[PDB]
Amino acid sequence: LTDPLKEDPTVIRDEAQFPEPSLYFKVFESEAGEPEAKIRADVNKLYDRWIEKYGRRWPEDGINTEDMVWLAEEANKRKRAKPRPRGTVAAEKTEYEDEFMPDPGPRTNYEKTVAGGKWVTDEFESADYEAGNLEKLWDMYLWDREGKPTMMPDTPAAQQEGEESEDFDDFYTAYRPRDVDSEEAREAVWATDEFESDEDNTESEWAPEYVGAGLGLVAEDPLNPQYSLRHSNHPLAPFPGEPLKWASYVYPDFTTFEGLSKQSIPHGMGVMTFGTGTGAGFAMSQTRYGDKYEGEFQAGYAHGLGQFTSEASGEVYIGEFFAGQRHGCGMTLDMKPYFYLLERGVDPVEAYRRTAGAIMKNVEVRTWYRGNKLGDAKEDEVVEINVLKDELDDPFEIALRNSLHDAKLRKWKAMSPQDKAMDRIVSIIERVQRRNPGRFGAYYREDEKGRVRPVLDSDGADTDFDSVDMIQGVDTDGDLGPGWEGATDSEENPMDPRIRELMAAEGMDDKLEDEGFKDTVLGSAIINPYTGLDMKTYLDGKERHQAELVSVYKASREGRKYLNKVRKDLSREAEDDRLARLYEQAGVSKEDERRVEGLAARWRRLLARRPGNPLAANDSDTGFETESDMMEMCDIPEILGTVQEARQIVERARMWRFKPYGEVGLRMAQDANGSPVSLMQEPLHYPHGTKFMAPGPLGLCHAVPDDPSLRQEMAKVAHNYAAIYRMYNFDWDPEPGTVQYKIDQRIRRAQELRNNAMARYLAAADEVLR
Amino acid sequence: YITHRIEKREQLNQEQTKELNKRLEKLKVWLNSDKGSSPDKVLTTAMQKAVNESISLSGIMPSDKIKTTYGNLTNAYTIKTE
Amino acid sequence: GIMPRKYLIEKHNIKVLKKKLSQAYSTQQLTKVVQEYKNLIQN
Amino acid sequence: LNVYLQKEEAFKRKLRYYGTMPMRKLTVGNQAPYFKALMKRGFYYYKPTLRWRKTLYVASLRRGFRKKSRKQRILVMPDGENSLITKPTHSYTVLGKRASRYRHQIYKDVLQHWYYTPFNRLLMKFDVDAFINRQPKSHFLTKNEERALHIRRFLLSEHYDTLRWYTYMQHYKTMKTNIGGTKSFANRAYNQQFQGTFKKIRHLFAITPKQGDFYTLKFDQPLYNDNKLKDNLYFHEELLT
Amino acid sequence: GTQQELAQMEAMELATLFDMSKPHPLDNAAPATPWKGELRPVPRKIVLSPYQYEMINYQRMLMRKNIWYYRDRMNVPRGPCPLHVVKEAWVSGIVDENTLFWGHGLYDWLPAKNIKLLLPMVRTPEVRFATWIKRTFSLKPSLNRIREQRKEHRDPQEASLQVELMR
Amino acid sequence: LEDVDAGLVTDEINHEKRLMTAAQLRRLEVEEWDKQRMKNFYLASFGGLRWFDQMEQALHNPLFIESRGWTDPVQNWVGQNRTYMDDLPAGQYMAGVGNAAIRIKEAELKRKLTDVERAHVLARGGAVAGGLLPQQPTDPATLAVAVGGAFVPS
Amino acid sequence: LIKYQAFDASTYDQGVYDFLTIEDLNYGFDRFWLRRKMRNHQIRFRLFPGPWMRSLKKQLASGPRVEFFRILFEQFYHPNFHDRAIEGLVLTNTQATLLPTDLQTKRTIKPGLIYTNSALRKFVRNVNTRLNLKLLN
Amino acid sequence: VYLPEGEKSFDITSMTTTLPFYAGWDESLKKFVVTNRLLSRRDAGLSVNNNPQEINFTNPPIQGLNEGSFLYWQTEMPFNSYNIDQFITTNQSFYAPLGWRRFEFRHSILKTWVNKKTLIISLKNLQPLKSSQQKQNQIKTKKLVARRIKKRYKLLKQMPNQLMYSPTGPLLTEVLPSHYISVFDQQYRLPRNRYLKRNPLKTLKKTTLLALMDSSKQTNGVNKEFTLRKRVKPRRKYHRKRFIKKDGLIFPRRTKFNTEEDDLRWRPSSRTKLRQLRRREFQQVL
Amino acid sequence: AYSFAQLKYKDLTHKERELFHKAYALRHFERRDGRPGDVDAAELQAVKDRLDPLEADRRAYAAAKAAGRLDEYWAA
Numbered sequence A: 001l002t003d004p005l006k007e008d009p010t011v012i013r014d015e016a017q018f019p020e021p022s023l024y025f026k027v028f029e030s031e032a033g034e035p036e037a038k039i040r041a042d043v044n045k046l047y048d049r050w051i052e053k054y055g056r057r058w059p060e061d062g063i064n065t066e067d068m069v070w071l072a073e074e075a076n077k078r079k080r081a082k083p084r085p086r087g088t089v090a091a092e093k094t095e096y097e098d099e100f101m102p103d104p105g106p107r108t109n110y111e112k113t114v115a116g117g118k119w120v121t122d123e124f125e126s127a128d129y130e131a132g133n134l135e136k137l138w139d140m141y142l143w144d145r146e147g148k149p150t151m152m153p154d155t156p157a158a159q160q161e162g163e164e165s166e167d168f169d170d171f172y173t174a175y176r177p178r179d180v181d182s183e184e185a186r187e188a189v190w191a192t193d194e195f196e197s198d199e200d201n202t203e204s205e206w207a208p209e210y211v212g213a214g215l216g217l218v219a220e221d222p223l224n225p226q227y228s229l230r231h232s233n234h235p236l237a238p239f240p241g242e243p244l245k246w247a248s249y250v251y252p253d254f255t256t257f258e259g260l261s262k263q264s265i266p267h268g269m270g271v272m273t274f275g276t277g278t279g280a281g282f283a284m285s286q287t288r289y290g291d292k293y294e295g296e297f298q299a300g301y302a303h304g305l306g307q308f309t310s311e312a313s314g315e316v317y318i319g320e321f322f323a324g325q326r327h328g329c330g331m332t333l334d335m336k337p338y339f340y341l342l343e344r345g346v347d348p349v350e351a352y353r354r355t356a357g358a359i360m361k362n363v364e365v366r367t368w369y370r371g372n373k374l375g376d377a378k379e380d381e382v383v384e385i386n387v388l389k390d391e392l393d394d395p396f397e398i399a400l401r402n403s404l405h406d407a408k409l410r411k412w413k414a415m416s417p418q419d420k421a422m423d424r425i426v427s428i429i430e431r432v433q434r435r436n437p438g439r440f441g442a443y444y445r446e447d448e449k450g451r452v453r454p455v456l457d458s459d460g461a462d463t464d465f466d467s468v469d470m471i472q473g474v475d476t477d478g479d480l481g482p483g484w485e486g487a488t489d490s491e492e493n494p495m496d497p498r499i500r501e502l503m504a505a506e507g508m509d510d511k512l513e514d515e516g517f518k519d520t521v522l523g524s525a526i527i528n529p530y531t532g533l534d535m536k537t538y539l540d541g542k543e544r545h546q547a548e549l550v551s552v553y554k555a556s557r558e559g560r561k562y563l564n565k566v567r568k569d570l571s572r573e574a575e576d577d578r579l580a581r582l583y584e585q586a587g588v589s590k591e592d593e594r595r596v597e598g599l600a601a602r603w604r605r606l607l608a609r610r611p612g613n614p615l616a617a618n619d620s621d622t623g624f625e626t627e628s629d630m631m632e633m634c635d636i637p638e639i640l641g642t643v644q645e646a647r648q649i650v651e652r653a654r655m656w657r658f659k660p661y662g663e664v665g666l667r668m669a670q671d672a673n674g675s676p677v678s679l680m681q682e683p684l685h686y687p688h689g690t691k692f693m694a695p696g697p698l699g700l701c702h703a704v705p706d707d708p709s710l711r712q713e714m715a716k717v718a719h720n721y722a723a724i725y726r727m728y729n730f731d732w733d734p735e736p737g738t739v740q741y742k743i744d745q746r747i748r749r750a751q752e753l754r755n756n757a758m759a760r761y762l763a764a765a766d767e768v769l770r
Numbered sequence B: 001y002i003t004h005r006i007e008k009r010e011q012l013n014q015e016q017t018k019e020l021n022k023r024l025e026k027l028k029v030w031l032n033s034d035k036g037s038s039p040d041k042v043l044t045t046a047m048q049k050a051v052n053e054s055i056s057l058s059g060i061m062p063s064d065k066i067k068t069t070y071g072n073l074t075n076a077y078t079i080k081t082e
Numbered sequence C: 001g002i003m004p005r006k007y008l009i010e011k012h013n014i015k016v017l018k019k020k021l022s023q024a025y026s027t028q029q030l031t032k033v034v035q036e037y038k039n040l041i042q043n
Numbered sequence D: 001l002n003v004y005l006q007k008e009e010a011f012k013r014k015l016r017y018y019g020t021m022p023m024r025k026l027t028v029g030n031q032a033p034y035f036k037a038l039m040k041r042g043f044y045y046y047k048p049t050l051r052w053r054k055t056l057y058v059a060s061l062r063r064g065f066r067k068k069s070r071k072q073r074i075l076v077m078p079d080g081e082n083s084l085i086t087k088p089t090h091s092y093t094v095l096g097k098r099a100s101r102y103r104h105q106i107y108k109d110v111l112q113h114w115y116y117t118p119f120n121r122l123l124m125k126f127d128v129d130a131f132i133n134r135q136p137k138s139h140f141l142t143k144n145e146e147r148a149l150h151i152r153r154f155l156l157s158e159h160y161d162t163l164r165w166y167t168y169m170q171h172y173k174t175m176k177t178n179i180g181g182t183k184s185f186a187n188r189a190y191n192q193q194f195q196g197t198f199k200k201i202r203h204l205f206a207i208t209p210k211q212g213d214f215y216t217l218k219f220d221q222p223l224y225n226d227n228k229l230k231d232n233l234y235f236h237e238e239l240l241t
Numbered sequence E: 001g002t003q004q005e006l007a008q009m010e011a012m013e014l015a016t017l018f019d020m021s022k023p024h025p026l027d028n029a030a031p032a033t034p035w036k037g038e039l040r041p042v043p044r045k046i047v048l049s050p051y052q053y054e055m056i057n058y059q060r061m062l063m064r065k066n067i068w069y070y071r072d073r074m075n076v077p078r079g080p081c082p083l084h085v086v087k088e089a090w091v092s093g094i095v096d097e098n099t100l101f102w103g104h105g106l107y108d109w110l111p112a113k114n115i116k117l118l119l120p121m122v123r124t125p126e127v128r129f130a131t132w133i134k135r136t137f138s139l140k141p142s143l144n145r146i147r148e149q150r151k152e153h154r155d156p157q158e159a160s161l162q163v164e165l166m167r
Numbered sequence F: 001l002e003d004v005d006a007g008l009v010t011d012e013i014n015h016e017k018r019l020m021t022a023a024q025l026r027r028l029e030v031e032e033w034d035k036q037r038m039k040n041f042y043l044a045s046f047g048g049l050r051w052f053d054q055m056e057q058a059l060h061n062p063l064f065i066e067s068r069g070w071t072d073p074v075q076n077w078v079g080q081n082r083t084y085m086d087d088l089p090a091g092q093y094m095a096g097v098g099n100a101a102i103r104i105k106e107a108e109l110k111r112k113l114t115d116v117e118r119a120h121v122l123a124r125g126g127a128v129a130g131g132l133l134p135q136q137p138t139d140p141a142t143l144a145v146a147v148g149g150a151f152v153p154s
Numbered sequence G: 001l002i003k004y005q006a007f008d009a010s011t012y013d014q015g016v017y018d019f020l021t022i023e024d025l026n027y028g029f030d031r032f033w034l035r036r037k038m039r040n041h042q043i044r045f046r047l048f049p050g051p052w053m054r055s056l057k058k059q060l061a062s063g064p065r066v067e068f069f070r071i072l073f074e075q076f077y078h079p080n081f082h083d084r085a086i087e088g089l090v091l092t093n094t095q096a097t098l099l100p101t102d103l104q105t106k107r108t109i110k111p112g113l114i115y116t117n118s119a120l121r122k123f124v125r126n127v128n129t130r131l132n133l134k135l136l137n
Numbered sequence H: 001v002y003l004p005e006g007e008k009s010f011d012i013t014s015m016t017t018t019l020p021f022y023a024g025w026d027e028s029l030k031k032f033v034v035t036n037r038l039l040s041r042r043d044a045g046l047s048v049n050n051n052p053q054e055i056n057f058t059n060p061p062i063q064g065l066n067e068g069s070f071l072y073w074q075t076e077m078p079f080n081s082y083n084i085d086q087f088i089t090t091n092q093s094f095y096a097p098l099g100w101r102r103f104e105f106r107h108s109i110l111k112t113w114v115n116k117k118t119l120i121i122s123l124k125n126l127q128p129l130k131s132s133q134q135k136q137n138q139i140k141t142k143k144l145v146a147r148r149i150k151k152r153y154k155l156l157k158q159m160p161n162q163l164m165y166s167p168t169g170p171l172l173t174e175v176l177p178s179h180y181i182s183v184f185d186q187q188y189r190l191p192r193n194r195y196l197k198r199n200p201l202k203t204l205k206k207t208t209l210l211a212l213m214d215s216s217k218q219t220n221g222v223n224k225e226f227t228l229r230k231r232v233k234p235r236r237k238y239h240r241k242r243f244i245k246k247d248g249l250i251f252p253r254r255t256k257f258n259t260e261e262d263d264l265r266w267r268p269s270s271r272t273k274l275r276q277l278r279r280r281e282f283q284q285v286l
Numbered sequence I: 001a002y003s004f005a006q007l008k009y010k011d012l013t014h015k016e017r018e019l020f021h022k023a024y025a026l027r028h029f030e031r032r033d034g035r036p037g038d039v040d041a042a043e044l045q046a047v048k049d050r051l052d053p054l055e056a057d058r059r060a061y062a063a064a065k066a067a068g069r070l071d072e073y074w075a076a
């Protein structure tokens, strides 16, 4: 077969017009929040329509009267829920004539328009049609005979008290009978303009994605995974808009940064030296004057892989960073004695010989979580301990749980999407009720006299919900958490009981005052006139209180006598019988259940925080709020690999350190007396017999100064340069026994296998189609 | 503790009784002119839209809009318990 | 209008340590570990 | 075996940290939500949203509002029911606003296409020919050769990844299946395209091989060797002894 | 029968084909023809599409204000280099196509010939003529003299960078 | 082994479950947030206390919204990213094993195939290979097919 | 864009762009289209009074319907617009040595780690369930 | 760890020192030499030894910040501290946001799944409560104390004129990157645009009762439920010219309501017989 | 007003905190009763040495080497 990788490049000939019809006439789903694209979309449709009639993407005559009708109704359709018409009128036209508009290719508007329909007649104002649409949507009467609103206030808006006038097309749409959705409300009041009659909500506006390091992602194009970073601010995102710049910043506190930057923020790779203060997200107490961090930066944070070096203290850390703190695997060395001997006039070789062994013995490998070292709170043994705890249960519970695990999967495999949504809603409701179950049936009662009264508890509380945790939060178990100036490093030093009770009483009277203010401010408005639901209870979330109160009042003797006077002028049993039917239908008597319960409890349970793995990826019902304060600790090979890659990252990042003419280079490169020095970084001048450093033919003409350490350094630099070179230049005909040869062999094998698979698919298609 | 336990509770009970009386009068306003739940009542708009969003994303093909009632919730709970 | 607010990080660290020791079913080590941590704060 | 599988699950939950993740718990000393917020907003990402078009230009109310009330239209010379709502028909005329916007878009498209016609770009063609004939003749590549070079680069990156210490990990298979073998994106194969706006060249050029049989837009250039390579290419001849 | 087994085996092979840790029998295999050192044939006729012309124009627009940097043998960045400074350094024989350069549109340091449009900018006809003169009459005799004078340049292992300077 | 072969894999089911759960949770939270903002706005406007206005401003904190994750797409909740797989062109070039064959046969027959014919052809093609061929992005053999279909014959 | 200085005159490395992109300012038809008001014909009378000439001019199949698509075809031509055109389970040795016995595989499972891990988890669950049921009987 | 490492050297890339060279006087060899030994970064910029006596620089490195100093170098610092940003409401709220989490859907849950006088208690027949209830009992008292501390109604009643009392959560951090202010660059709509600015009805007059009776009669006694949500569209009057009719009287035009015979539906009857437009400051702009 | 030291060193006493606050923040010209020379340099340098002993030791060794009195340095 022909070699795909050895085609003769004698004649190169491409045929592609720059305004490419493949790339130009196309609408992307990536362009969703952009309004102008909508117009383009319609235009594109028109093009296709013309191609369907003339085949030239250009219309004879021009845009006709029926093109707008087609593009309005027939072109694109939107999802509705359900119609339910009727065939008989329920109103009378005996009132002032021309009150209701009449209602009896005539198929539709487009069919009539293409059959010679002028559509030129104009009549009536828009407000009448919008009011009629709202009235039919409500299925009520919103205006009386005189024309004054019946469901909204008709008096002029009081400028005092903060109220302002509101049009009907807004009030009758922001306040609706809950069987009308936002889309139908917008469609009823003729909201058509794309640019001015639409706004983006605070919680629904488009924002760039967050990908972090961007390692684990679904690749839309498998060959190039960088294509999936186009919607983020990742340093390697394609075409940011402004080129990444080699920033060399000196801050007023003498903190210096040198490396890649996006906009004006450090971004990509670089080296940062700390002066007074801090930077790169580090804590104020971590750094000193002269410490440095080399490695990856992201959004001004030391995020990724790097190395932190402190010349004053000697600590050296190599490894992973998240945000501005150590998070992941890391390796720690303490080279303090080496620096101590170096600063006291000892040559480096002698100091290394003296202090190599002690430093090598004290090398530490660790796993860090949010800047804290793990391994002291038995983080390593958590999983095994939890497995043993799960194994310590009674056999019946374990068997039932294991059967339920398979039953859930088998049930979910065959459910409909609507059934899945309902199931997830039920699960969410159950999870919520596991913390705050409503006091249904215990909100209102009747006293001895028969008067309805609220049902309080052993305290001054009507429901378990408190509005003070909204500003302070709640832990996983139920405790609140830190507050303003909470002090009490450990709460084993509690507050005095007298102060506690006094403050509790003061909080109770404050709650009473708050309730009084809320009532006197919001209780006058009416939300639901059928049940007397005011705005205060509606906005406090106590609608079920009113729902129970209505039934309690109507069932009371006083309520019954009032109803008589004005007239003068699931259940527990259902669940029980369903459970009994389920028990009977399976052939399991209650005696068997009692026997099994006795066997489990008296014979097994008497013989001798939810179950599961605390560190689990898939958890069915999660809530995305429970937080793990630990991670699987790195093993030695993983730490070694992390250090090996971090050293590569540091070496690659240390290439932005001495920009030729930059502020840091001009102001921080000094001799012994502190005066500036003329660094040999001229692009054309190589003085004092250093022309061997020229990376060209000129360098070969001159000789090296004959220093073994310099020769080793040059050899290492040459090795790095060759390693960089090999990644962009290949051989046309590789020799057998080399890596590139096996790569080419595998590529050819892949092509052959794909061709065979396609041939088999074609054979199957031919068999099916004939 | 006694001052917090008894007096404040009585004051809160009295205020709740006054508000209950006002709410009862508001209800009586409609009850006078009435001159006369079902499983067909629709849910709150939040729960009516979350189901639509989950159906839209989860399904292989987008589906039409629905207005969920309490009967569907009852059916789902019954199925899970069964 | 100066309303003081304190940075409570040691309290949160102690609470997280208690939670981690609770999840490992090793509460008997609590008074052994937490105390040591407090000493680490002192010096 | 159960302990091993649970450790694998815990390791996968640990690996979750290297991609998109929700941060829904604000705690003292945790800087992750601040980093997420600064990454979401803090840099400007170009996108033609409503906020951008309102920023550009709205209108000039010299004579007041330029848009007026809508006028319903009715057919004079001859519906699926749905008579609940009467739909607006003010736009069925050709002299309306929507037709004006459509004609504006059509005119823009036609004139943009006519702007790049070959006979209006002769001097550019001559100058580009003169400029591009300066490079050596062996630097020109076919599209298939460029794709082969890209594939070779990323396969060689994977091969060099296969030599790291990560292979000795207990859970190396999970890491390779989930992450990809390296803990940094910078140690993999990627194109050198970090200038210009993405949303502006979407309809002009191609940026990924899957878009079609086109030359991708990038600022780097893989090449074939034009001679028998000397191993000590960057080595000084004095060092080789 | 056998067809289905072969298809399943081929699918299994496809599953693990690009797993570079797994050895493969097609590695280091005997080619259909004996191996001889070949080179890619030099193209003769090139026909650019308008797409390529416009892409080149756009790239030239992006890089018309760039300032370049390069690295020496000691791995030190060297000087702020506008286009004419780069041309002078190329003519003087200080840099060549293998030098590591950096500009605005890149993320890392790459060889000069691997940057998209850097060699066409430098290589004006005058630059070519001057670099040919410099290579032929100044650097080559000096290299011969330094090779003859000092024995530290091993005859069997001699670099050929001066020979290819003209390109 | 039978349960695994039947498709009852825990991960592929739990992923969808958590995606739907997050989808419902986002809406259920953003509606209560709106109600709590409206209550405070009405208290501040119709009343005369600045404390409720400051409470509404605190509820309008961008950091709180970002931490809640309401702006982020629901996919980022579970761990993956939103992919527009339909934007990429669907042609013979880099088509996949089945799609390329279907398009070639349609071109040979000069007429587009229907849904039932396409389903039957794809089913038989998958069955003849034992079903081991990649069909989803997470399959390990997608990259090999993509590389194999990356060269256009001259 | 009369509110801003909508032109780019930056020199050297210095240059910033936000919501006024490089392509709009410097490149191609975006820059050319963004300045379309320079080529709009205006009515002017140098000597005669404005209102009288305007009234006379106003005193004197429509334009937008047909002429818009006619003039574009006549003047600005482009072909794109105006041309008609078994061992199916692969277990590592660490996984293999953890199985209690030597078991036989009768099914070919799709390649991948997730399926193998799911099979192992299901086997563990089944073994535990069987052990508990046997003990409780 | 008992793994082979002799074939390689653990370094994929060699670590090369990157330091520029310069020529100077060694004063130890007493020779003019080219080297790369630069002054340490722990002493660069702090002092110079030009004169035989060392000179220490005072002003150059700043070691403190005040209001004016912060205002002069506001956009040139690498970090921002809470000690100065605590006097701005938005900055303080960004430093210490609300801790609201684990929402309870009290507005939407409503109905549940399936369906009290004081009792004299003798002390001798009571048993100690388990440890799982003491914490729950203490939680309510802790919440009451938190409400006393953070929502003292006395202070917030007179806060604007002579005090400062704002709702914030616990302090999460002390320093932030100096470019966090950019998060506030894109603003949100004012609350008046999002919500309605006037209350619904407060009284039920004759026409309202008639309409409610008709609506209830239509639905076989199953009354409707009303919800109050945010605005669905912007005000049309701000960007559009609309006709004004009579004194606000509206006569809707529509088709008749569909189900006749005996009971029809009747609309209730109460009696039963030119400058330049100013420019508003938009909030959703770049 | 802060002095970059109350946020860095967590063991500062009230007197040392006030000394740093007056020395590097709210200078004598920024205080209503401030006068030149209010902050003593010797006490501030002593506090700085107490907060970081090793840097002071290194500088002392450097000074002794410059003065050629290393015996007195090592005999301390």
Ligand SMILES: O=P(O)(O)O[C@H]1[C@H](OP(=O)(O)O)[C@@H](OP(=O)(O)O)[C@H](OP(=O)(O)O)[C@@H](OP(=O)(O)O)[C@H]1OP(=O)(O)O
Pocket: H121, H122, H123, H124
């Ligand atoms: O429940 P009972 O058996 O009826 O006993 C109670 C009990 O007293 P004894 O424990 O001595 O029986 C009460 O005291 P405590 O146990 O709660 O401490 C006491 O009330 P005091 O606490 O006020 O003493 C009360 O008597 P009384 O109701 O008269 O106060 C008395 O009930 P009897 O009086 O019916 O025996």
